[PDB]
Structure formats: structure tokens, C-alpha cells
mmCIF file with all atom_site columns, C-alpha atoms in Angstrom:
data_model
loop_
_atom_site.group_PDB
_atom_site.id
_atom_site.type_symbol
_atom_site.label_atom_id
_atom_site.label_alt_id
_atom_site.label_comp_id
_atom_site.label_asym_id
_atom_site.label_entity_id
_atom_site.label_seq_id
_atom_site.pdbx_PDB_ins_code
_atom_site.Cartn_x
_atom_site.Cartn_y
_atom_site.Cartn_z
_atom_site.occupancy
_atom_site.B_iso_or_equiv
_atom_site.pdbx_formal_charge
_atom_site.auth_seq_id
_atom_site.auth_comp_id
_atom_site.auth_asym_id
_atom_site.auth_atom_id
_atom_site.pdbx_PDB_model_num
ATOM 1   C CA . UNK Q 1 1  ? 28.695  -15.522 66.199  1.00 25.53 ? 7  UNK Q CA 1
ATOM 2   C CA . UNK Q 1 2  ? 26.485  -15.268 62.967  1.00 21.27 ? 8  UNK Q CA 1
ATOM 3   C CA . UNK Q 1 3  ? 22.646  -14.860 62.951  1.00 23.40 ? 9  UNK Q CA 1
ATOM 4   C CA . UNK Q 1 4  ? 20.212  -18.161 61.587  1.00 20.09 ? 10 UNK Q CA 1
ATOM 5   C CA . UNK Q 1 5  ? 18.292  -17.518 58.007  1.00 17.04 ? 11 UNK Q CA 1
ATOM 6   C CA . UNK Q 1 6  ? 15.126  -19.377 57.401  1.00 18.89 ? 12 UNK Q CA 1
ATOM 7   C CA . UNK Q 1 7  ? 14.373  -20.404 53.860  1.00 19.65 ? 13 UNK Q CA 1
ATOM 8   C CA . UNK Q 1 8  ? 10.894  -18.539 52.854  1.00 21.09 ? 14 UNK Q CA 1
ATOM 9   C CA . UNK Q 1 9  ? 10.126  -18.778 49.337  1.00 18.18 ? 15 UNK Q CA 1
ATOM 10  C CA . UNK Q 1 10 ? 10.569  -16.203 46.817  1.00 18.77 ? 16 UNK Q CA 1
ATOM 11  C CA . UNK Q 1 11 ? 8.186   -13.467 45.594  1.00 17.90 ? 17 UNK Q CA 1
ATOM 12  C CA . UNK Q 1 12 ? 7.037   -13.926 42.350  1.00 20.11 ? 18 UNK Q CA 1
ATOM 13  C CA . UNK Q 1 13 ? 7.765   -11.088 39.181  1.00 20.43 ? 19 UNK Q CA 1
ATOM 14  C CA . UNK Q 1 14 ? 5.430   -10.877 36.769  1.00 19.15 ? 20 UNK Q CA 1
ATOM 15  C CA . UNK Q 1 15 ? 6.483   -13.553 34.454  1.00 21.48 ? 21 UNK Q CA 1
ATOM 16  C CA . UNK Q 1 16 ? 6.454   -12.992 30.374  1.00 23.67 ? 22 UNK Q CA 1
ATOM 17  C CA . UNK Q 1 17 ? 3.999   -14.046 28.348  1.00 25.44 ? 23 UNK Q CA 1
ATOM 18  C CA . UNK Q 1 18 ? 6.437   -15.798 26.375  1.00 27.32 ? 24 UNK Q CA 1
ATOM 19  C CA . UNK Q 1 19 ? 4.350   -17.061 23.379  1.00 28.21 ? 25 UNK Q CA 1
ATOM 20  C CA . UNK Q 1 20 ? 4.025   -16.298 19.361  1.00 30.19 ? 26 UNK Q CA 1
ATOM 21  C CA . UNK Q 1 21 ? 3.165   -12.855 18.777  1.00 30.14 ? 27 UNK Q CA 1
ATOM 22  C CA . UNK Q 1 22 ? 1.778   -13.541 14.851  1.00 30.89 ? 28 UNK Q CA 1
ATOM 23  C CA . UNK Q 1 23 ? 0.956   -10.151 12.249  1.00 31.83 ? 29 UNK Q CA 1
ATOM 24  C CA . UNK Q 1 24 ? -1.301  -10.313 9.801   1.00 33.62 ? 30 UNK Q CA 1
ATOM 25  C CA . UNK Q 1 25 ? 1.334   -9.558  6.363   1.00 34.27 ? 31 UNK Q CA 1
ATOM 26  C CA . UNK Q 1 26 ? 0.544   -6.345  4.568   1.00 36.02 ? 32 UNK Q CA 1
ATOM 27  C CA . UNK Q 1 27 ? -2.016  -6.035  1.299   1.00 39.66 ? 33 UNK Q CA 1
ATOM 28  C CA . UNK Q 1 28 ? -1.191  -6.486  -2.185  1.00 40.38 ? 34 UNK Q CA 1
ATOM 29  C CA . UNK Q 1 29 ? -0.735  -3.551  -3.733  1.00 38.96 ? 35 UNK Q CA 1
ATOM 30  C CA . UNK Q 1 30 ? -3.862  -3.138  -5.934  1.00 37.79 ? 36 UNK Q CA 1
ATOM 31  C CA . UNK Q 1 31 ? -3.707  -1.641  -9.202  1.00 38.43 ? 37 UNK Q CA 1
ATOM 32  C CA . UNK Q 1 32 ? -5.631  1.715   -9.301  1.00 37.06 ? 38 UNK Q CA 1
ATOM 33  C CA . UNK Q 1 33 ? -7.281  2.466   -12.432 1.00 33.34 ? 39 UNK Q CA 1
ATOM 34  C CA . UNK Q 1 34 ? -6.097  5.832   -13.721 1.00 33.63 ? 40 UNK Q CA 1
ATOM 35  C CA . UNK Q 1 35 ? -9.357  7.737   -13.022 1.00 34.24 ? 41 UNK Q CA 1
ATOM 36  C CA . UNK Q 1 36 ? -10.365 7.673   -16.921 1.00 30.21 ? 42 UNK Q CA 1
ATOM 37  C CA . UNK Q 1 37 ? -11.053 11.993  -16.689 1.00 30.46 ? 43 UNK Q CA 1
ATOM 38  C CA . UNK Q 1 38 ? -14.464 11.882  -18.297 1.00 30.06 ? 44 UNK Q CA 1
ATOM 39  C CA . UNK Q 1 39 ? -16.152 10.187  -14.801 1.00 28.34 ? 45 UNK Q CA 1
ATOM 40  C CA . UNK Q 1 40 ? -14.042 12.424  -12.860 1.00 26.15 ? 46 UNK Q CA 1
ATOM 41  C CA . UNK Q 1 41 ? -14.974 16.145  -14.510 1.00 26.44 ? 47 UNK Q CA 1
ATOM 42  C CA . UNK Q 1 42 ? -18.794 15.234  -13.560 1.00 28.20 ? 48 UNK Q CA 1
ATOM 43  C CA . UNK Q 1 43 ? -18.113 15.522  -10.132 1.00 26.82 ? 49 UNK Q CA 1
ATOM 44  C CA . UNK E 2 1  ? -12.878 -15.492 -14.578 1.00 29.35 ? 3  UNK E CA 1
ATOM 45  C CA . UNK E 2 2  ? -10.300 -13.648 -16.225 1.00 28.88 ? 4  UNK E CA 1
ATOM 46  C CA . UNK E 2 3  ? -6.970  -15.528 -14.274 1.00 29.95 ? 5  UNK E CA 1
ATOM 47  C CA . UNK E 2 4  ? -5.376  -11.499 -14.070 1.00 30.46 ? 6  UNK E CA 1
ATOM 48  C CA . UNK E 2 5  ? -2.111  -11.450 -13.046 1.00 29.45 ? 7  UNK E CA 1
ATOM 49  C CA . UNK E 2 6  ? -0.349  -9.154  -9.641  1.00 30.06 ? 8  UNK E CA 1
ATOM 50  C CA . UNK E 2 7  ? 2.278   -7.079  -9.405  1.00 32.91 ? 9  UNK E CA 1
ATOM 51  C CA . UNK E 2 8  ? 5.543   -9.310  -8.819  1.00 33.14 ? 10 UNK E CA 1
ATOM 52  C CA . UNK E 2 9  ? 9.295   -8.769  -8.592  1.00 33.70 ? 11 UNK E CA 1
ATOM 53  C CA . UNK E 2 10 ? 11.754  -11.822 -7.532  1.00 38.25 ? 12 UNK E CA 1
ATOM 54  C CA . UNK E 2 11 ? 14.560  -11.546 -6.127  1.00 38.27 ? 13 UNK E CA 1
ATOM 55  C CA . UNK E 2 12 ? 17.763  -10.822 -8.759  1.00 36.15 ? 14 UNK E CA 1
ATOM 56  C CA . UNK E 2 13 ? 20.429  -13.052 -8.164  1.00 40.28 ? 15 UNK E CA 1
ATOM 57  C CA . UNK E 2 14 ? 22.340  -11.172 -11.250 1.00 41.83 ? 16 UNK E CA 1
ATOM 58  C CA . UNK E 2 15 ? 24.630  -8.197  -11.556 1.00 41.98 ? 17 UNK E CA 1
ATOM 59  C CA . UNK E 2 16 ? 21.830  -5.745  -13.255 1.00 42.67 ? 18 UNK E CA 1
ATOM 60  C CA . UNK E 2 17 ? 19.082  -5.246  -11.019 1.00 41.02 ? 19 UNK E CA 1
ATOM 61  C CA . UNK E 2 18 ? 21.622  -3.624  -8.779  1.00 39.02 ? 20 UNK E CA 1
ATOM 62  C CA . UNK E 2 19 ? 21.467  -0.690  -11.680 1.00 40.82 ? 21 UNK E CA 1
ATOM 63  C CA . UNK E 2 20 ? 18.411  0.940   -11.763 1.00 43.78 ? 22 UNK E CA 1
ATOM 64  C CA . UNK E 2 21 ? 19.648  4.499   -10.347 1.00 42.83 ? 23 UNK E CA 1
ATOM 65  C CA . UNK E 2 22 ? 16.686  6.364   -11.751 1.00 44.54 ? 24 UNK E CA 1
ATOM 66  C CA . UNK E 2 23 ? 14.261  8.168   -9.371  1.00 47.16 ? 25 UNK E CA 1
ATOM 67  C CA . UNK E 2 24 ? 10.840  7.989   -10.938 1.00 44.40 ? 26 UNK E CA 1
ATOM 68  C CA . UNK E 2 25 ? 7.563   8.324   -8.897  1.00 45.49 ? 27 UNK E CA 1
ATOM 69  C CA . UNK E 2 26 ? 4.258   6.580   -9.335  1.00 43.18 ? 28 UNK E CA 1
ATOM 70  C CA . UNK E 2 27 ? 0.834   6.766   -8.429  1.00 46.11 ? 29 UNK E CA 1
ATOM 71  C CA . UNK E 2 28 ? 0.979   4.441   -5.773  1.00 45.06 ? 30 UNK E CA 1
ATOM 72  C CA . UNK E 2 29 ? 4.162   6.428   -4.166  1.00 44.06 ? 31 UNK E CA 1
ATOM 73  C CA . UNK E 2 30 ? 2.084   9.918   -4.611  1.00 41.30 ? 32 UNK E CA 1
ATOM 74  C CA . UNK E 2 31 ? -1.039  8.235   -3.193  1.00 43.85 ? 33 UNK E CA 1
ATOM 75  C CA . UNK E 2 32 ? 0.817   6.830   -0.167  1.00 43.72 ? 34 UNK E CA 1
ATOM 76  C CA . UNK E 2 33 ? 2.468   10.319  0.613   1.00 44.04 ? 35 UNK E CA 1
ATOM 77  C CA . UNK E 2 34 ? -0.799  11.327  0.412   1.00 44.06 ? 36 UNK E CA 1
ATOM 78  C CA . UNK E 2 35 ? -2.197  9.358   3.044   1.00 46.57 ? 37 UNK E CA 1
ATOM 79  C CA . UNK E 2 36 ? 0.899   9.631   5.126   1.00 47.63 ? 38 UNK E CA 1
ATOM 80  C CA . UNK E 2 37 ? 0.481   13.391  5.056   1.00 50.59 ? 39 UNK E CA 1
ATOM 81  C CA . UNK E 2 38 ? -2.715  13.388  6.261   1.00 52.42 ? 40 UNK E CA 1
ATOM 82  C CA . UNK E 2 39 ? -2.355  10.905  8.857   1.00 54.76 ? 41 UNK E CA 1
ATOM 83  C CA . UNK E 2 40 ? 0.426   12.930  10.585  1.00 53.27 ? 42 UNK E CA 1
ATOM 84  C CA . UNK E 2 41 ? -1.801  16.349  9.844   1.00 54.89 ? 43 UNK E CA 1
ATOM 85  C CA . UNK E 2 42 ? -4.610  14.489  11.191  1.00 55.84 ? 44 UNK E CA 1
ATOM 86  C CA . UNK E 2 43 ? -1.615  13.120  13.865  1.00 53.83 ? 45 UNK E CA 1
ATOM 87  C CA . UNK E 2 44 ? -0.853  17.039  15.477  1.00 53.86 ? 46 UNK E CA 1
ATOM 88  C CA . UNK E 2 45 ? -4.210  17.926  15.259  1.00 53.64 ? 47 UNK E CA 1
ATOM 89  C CA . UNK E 2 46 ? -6.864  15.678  15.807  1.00 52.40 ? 48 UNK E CA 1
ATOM 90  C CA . UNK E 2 47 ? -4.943  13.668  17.935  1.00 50.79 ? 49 UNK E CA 1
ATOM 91  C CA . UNK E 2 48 ? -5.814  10.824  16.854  1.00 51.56 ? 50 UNK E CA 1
ATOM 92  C CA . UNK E 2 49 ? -4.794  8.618   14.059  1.00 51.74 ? 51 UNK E CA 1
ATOM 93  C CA . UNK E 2 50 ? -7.220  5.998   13.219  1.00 53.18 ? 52 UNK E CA 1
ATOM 94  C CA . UNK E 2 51 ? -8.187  8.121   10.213  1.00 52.96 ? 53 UNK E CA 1
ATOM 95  C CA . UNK E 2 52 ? -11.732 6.868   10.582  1.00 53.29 ? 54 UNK E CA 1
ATOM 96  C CA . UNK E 2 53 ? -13.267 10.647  9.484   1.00 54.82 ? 55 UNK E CA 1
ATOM 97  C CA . UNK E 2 54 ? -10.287 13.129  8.643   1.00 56.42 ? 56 UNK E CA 1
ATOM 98  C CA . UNK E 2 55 ? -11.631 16.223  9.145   1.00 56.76 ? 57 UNK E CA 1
ATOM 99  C CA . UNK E 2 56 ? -8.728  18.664  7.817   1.00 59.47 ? 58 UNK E CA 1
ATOM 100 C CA . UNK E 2 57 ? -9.495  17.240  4.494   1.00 60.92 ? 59 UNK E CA 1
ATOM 101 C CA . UNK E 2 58 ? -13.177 18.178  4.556   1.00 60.99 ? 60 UNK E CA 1
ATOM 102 C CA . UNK E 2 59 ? -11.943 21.751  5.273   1.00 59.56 ? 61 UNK E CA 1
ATOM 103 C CA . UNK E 2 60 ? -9.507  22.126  3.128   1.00 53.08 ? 62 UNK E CA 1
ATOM 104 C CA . UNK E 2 61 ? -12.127 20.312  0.265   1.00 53.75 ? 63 UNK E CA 1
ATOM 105 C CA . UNK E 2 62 ? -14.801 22.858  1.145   1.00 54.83 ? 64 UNK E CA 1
ATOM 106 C CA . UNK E 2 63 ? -12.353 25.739  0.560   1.00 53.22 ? 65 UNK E CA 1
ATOM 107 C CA . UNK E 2 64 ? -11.216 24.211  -2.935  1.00 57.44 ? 66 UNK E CA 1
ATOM 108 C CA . UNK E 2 65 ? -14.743 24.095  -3.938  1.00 56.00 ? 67 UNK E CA 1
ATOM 109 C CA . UNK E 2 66 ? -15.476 27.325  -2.772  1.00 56.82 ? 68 UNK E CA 1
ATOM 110 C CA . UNK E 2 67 ? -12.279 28.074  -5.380  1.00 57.78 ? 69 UNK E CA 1
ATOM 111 C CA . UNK E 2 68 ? -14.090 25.759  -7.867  1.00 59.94 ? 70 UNK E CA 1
ATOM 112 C CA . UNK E 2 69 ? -17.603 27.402  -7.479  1.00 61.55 ? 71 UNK E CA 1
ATOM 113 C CA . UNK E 2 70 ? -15.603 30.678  -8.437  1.00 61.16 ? 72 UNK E CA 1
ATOM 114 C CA . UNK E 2 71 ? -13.635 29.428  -11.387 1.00 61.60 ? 73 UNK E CA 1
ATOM 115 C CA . UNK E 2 72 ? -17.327 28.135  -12.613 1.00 60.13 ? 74 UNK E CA 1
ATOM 116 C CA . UNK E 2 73 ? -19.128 31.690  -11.705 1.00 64.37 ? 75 UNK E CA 1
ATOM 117 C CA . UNK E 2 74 ? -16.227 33.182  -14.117 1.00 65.10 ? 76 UNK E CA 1
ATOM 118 C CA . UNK E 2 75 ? -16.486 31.259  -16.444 1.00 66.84 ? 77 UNK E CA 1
ATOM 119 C CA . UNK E 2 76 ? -20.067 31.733  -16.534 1.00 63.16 ? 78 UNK E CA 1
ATOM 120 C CA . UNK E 2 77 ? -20.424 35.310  -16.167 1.00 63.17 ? 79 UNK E CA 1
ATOM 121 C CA . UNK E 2 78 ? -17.377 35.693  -19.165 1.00 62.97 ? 80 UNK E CA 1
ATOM 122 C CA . UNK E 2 79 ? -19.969 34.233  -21.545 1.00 61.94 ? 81 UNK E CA 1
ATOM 123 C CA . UNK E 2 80 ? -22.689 36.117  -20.613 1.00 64.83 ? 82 UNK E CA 1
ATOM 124 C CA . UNK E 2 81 ? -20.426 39.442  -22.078 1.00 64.71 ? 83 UNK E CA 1
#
């Protein structure tokens, strides 16, 4: 009546890295010196 | 050193901070649209956006100071007369 299988194993996908992806956190917002005019009219 | 002190804000926790409703803009907010608007016009252009050597901003500085060196040229040849 029905046809026979045979068990081969499966194909492998290409698995996730599944791991901890870390980012460095952003800077610290430095304070910038209003220029102070007089060393900025020289150039 | 001198033991400075950064730039904090905590978090509220207190019906006030929720007030502020005043748009003012700083340095650091002009600065950063600055750099954002020339790392998109570097972005359509260049076509690349490590912003390494921008090189819109070295044109459009070389035209300024040709504007400068013209300013200083009239102001020079006004005090001659």
C-alpha cells in the first residue's frame, strides 16, 4: 500500500550566533569653552 | 587636581520637572546640528560618512574666505581715501 521512509538526518541552517552583543555607552558631554573672541579674530 | 564637577540631571520623581515648556537652544544643540548637517551633506555626496576629511566644508570655507579676504581689501582700500 504505502511507500517505506528511511530516517537520514537533517540539514543543518545556519545557526545564530546567539551571544552578548555589548556597545560601548556614549561620551560625556564636554563643556566647550565659549571661544573667548580675542583668540578667535586672529585667525 | 581641581575635583571639577560634570554635567548631571537625575531623574525627578516630583510634579515640576514635568514643566519646563520653554524651547531654548544651546551650544551643544547648535554644534550637534552642525555636525549632523554635514554628515548627511557629506552623506548624498561623498558617499561616505565616516567624516574622516569632509570636503564640502573646505569648499564652502575657501569661498567664505574668499568673502573675508574682500571684506579686509575694503576695509583697507576705505582708509587709504
Amino acid at each position: 500500500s504505502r511507500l517505506i521512509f528511511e530516517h537520514q538526518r537533517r540539514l543543518t541552517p545556519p545557526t545564530t550566533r546567539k551571544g552578548t552583543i555589548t556597545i560601548e555607552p556614549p561620551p560625556q558631554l564636554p563643556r566647550v569653552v565659549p571661544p573667548s573672541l580675542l583668540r578667535r579674530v586672529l585667525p | 587636581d581641581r575635583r571639577s564637577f560634570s554635567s548631571r540631571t537625575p531623574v525627578n520623581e516630583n510634579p515640576d520637572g514635568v514643566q519646563y515648556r520653554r524651547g531654548f537652544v544651546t551650544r551643544h544643540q547648535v554644534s550637534g546640528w552642525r555636525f549632523v548637517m554635514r554628515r548627511i551633506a557629506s552623506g548624498v555626496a561623498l558617499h561616505d560618512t565616516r567624516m574622516l576629511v569632509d570636503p564640502l566644508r573646505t569648499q564652502s570655507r575657501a569661498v567664505l574666505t574668499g568673502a573675508l579676504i574682500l571684506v579686509t581689501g575694503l576695509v583697507g582700500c576705505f582708509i587709504f581715501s
